[PDB]
Structure 1
Amino acid sequence: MKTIEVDDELYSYIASHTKHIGESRSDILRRMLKFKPVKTIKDKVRAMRELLLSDEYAEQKRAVNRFMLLLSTLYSLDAQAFAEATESLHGRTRVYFAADEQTLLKNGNQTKPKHVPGTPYWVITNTNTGRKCSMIEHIMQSMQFPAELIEKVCGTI
């Protein structure tokens, strides 16, 4: 993180372009400025199905563990899509995903952020299983997965 200094007026302006909770000046600015090959949908769907059946997935003991492994895998399938599916995802006061731990600790608290393996992202953990499904569902819907797959996946969390 690097630092620049803006005058009082220009500051209020950027501040007024705030859309949703927890976004940074960086976020807001890139929006105000207009500032890769991927696997097929079938291949994506296959990978997720393989995962649900995979041994690794059964070995995961608790929800939070499946939750994480699900995110790692989703991200590996389409970084761009995951990013988009994730940047608009948050709660009333808590930010759900961030590119660093501090942002999550700063906005929420006791959110128990964990870094998502094989991923530049951190996500909050202090949530019930239900809300974990909501996040996964919302993400997969955004990433354009079949409704029936999303259903089968949330049933395993």
Structure 2
Amino acid sequence: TIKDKVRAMRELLLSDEYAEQKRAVNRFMLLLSTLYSLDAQAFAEATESLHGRTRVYFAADEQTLLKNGNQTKPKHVPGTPYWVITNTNTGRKCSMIEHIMQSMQFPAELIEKVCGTI
């Protein structure tokens, strides 16, 4: 099932829906949603350790996010009990995906390929 999680992400990068995403934030959201469905638990853990200095990065409610940082442009993550801040440059959306994908035990080359498409 790690071989399967890898296959899935690889398929996603090839999928039409992924291609359909117009901007980085759009790909970012679809990356998160896909990651979850693969392993809700691991995504839960990987997420606890993911936060900023003064901003929470992930929470189960728009409220918590809007409450710790100034403007974070929170956005619910489709098919998920989570919310994530969106007011971040591309390099930081990559850091986030990297953190999460390392925690979920994905190979490095895949992570590198994923981030390169954000």
User: Common fold, TM-score beyond 0.5?
Assistant: yes
- CA deviation string 1:27-63 (max 9, x = no partner): xxxxxxxxxxxxx100000000000000000100000
Q: How many residues are paired up?
A: 118
- CA deviation string 1:49-95 (max 9, x = no partner): 00000000010000000000000000000000000000111111000
1:131 aligns with 2:92: yes
Bigger relative contact order, structure 1 or 2 (CA pairs below 8 A, ≥6 apart): 2
**Structure 1 unaligned spans of 5+:** 1-39
Alignment correspondent of 1:60: 21
CA RMSD of aligned residues (A): 0.4
TM-score (norm 1): 0.75
The alpha-carbon deviation at position 111 of structure 1 amounts to 0.3
TM-score (norm 2): 0.99
Alignment correspondent of 2:4: 43
- CA deviation string 1:108-157 (max 9, x = no partner): 12100000000000000000000000000000000000000000000000
**Structure 2 unaligned spans of 5+:** none
**Aligned-pair identity (%):** 100
Alignment correspondent of 1:96: 57
The alpha-carbon deviation at position 103 of structure 1 amounts to 0.3
